[PDB]
């Protein structure tokens, strides 16, 4: 098939500002390509086809340009329910092929997370295993690191993560890390931290409890 | 007006098969062209395939060349996407999508069914209080850790609805055993866990499973 690349990935812009996607074609497909926004839940929608033309009740700051091999969706002036993701798409040839898609997000103040350590449940502990539960809430930018120690060592591999989109609300993320653990390896040891590094902490906030609340 | 309604998504097991329908009204289906485009879970959209009205001809995605057969039934006003030697990497939600003209219109998608491949088990949720632990003044985190499940998806809700407003329902991470795990948390004044109660409500339809669990600080 033809291979479509769109770049970038991900963009972080203000309202206001200028925006520009670029969508890359593996071979030329002349004018036959469509641009599409997709908010979470919602259906695609059409907003340029052939290339350049606008679809009908589509805000004129959004514009494409191109032929053959390279294309370019714009948006002059970056409005607040814009913020989404956007997929081109070639027809020129079946099969159809979407590009990987472009998530614009909202740019905002840094904002550093309030950190909050969750030790395992009794009744967990009784069914052979432990997780232990480090929250990242309303911060910004995405960028974080989390870093679980036990007894002060390090861990890797037995840890994993997941973050919100944004908030509706202030534009901040919230992150969950989840370090699991047999009970037995759980009770081999005292002291369980997570580690948080984030640009708007002057160093390392860790969290952390002994187990057995002590 | 325009509707279309997939039916037919569920799990299955590694190299086997499962067929989905999509129900339409709303618009002469007899004389549209009919895709499907599946979208993984937080990735792209994926086109599929396509039959036109009379399906005299049936094109498809490399990814699914050989695997995949489009078909359709105007007479039910029905369209039909047979999937055979399915893998990991087809586990995605499956759309029905047409057009008034070529190429596709928000009007003119389906709602969804979600397709799982996987060697794991239907399996309901083990749902397991995150505690908060100064409780005269400051702010409390608290939550439920929704554990070793499949397929997506659960709901959360938080005092039956009363209570939204700082609450995070985190994505669903895929364990190595196959199954998911995912945590719901809120935050709240601290003060305020001296006189109100917490219940987080956990809905897993694929195994009939409704928790409701009462999230308080431990004895100390």
């Known amino acids: 098939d033809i291979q479509m690349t769109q770049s970038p990935s991900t963009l972080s812009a203000s309202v206001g500002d200028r925006v520009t996607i670029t969508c890359r074609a593996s071979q030329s497909i002349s004018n036959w390509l469509a641009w599409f926004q997709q908010k979470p839940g919602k259906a695609p929608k059409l907003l340029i086809y052939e290339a350049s033309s606008l679809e009908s009740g589509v805000p004129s700051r959004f514009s494409g340009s191109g032929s053959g091999t390279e294309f370019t969706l714009t948006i002059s002036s970056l409005q607040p329910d814009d913020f989404a993701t956007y997929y081109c798409?070639?027809?020129?040839?079946?099969?159809?092929?979407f590009g990987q898609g472009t998530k614009v997000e909202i740019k905002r103040t840094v904002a550093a997370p309030s950190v909050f350590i969750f030790p395992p449940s009794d009744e967990q502990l009784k069914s052979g295993t432990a997780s232990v539960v480090c929250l990242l809430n309303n911060f910004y930018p995405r960028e974080a690191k989390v870093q679980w120690k036990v007894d002060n060592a390090l861990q890797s591999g037995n840890s994993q993560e997941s973050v919100t989109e944004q908030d509706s609300k202030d534009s901040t993320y919230s992150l969950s890390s989840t370090l699991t653990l047999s009970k037995a390896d759980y009770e081999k040891h005292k002291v369980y931290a997570c580690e948080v590094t984030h640009q708007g902490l002057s160093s390392p906030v860790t969290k952390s409890f002994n187990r057995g609340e002590c | 007006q325009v509707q279309l309604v997939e039916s037919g998504g569920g799990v299955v097991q590694p190299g086997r098969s499962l067929r989905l329908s999509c129900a339409a009204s709303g618009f002469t289906f007899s004389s549209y062209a009919m895709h499907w485009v599946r979208q993984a879970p937080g990735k792209g959209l994926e086109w599929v395939a396509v039959?036109?009205?009379?399906?005299?001809?049936?094109y498809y995605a490399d990814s699914v060349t050989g695997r995949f057969t489009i078909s359709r039934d105007n007479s039910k006003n029905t369209l039909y996407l047979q999937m055979n030697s399915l893998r990991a990497e087809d586990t995605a939600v499956y759309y029905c999508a047409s057009s008034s003209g070529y190429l596709f219109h928000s009007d003119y998608w389906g709602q969804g069914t979600l397709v799982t491949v996987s060697s794991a088990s239907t399996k309901g949720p083990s749902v397991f209080p995150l505690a908060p632990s100064s409780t005269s003044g400051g702010t409390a985190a608290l939550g439920c850790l929704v554990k070793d499940y499949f397929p997506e998806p659960v709901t959360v809700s938080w005092n039956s609805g009363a209570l939204t407003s700082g609450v995070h329902t985190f994505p669903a991470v895929l364990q190595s055993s196959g199954l998911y795990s995912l945590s719901s948390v809120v935050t709240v004044p601290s003060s305020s866990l001296g006189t109100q109660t917490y219940i987080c409500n956990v809905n897993h339809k694929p195994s009939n499973t409704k928790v409701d669990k009462r999230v308080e600080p431990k004895s100390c």
């Open positions: 039959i036109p009205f009379d399906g005299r001809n049936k």
């Open positions: 798409q070639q027809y020129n040839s079946y099969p159809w092929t």
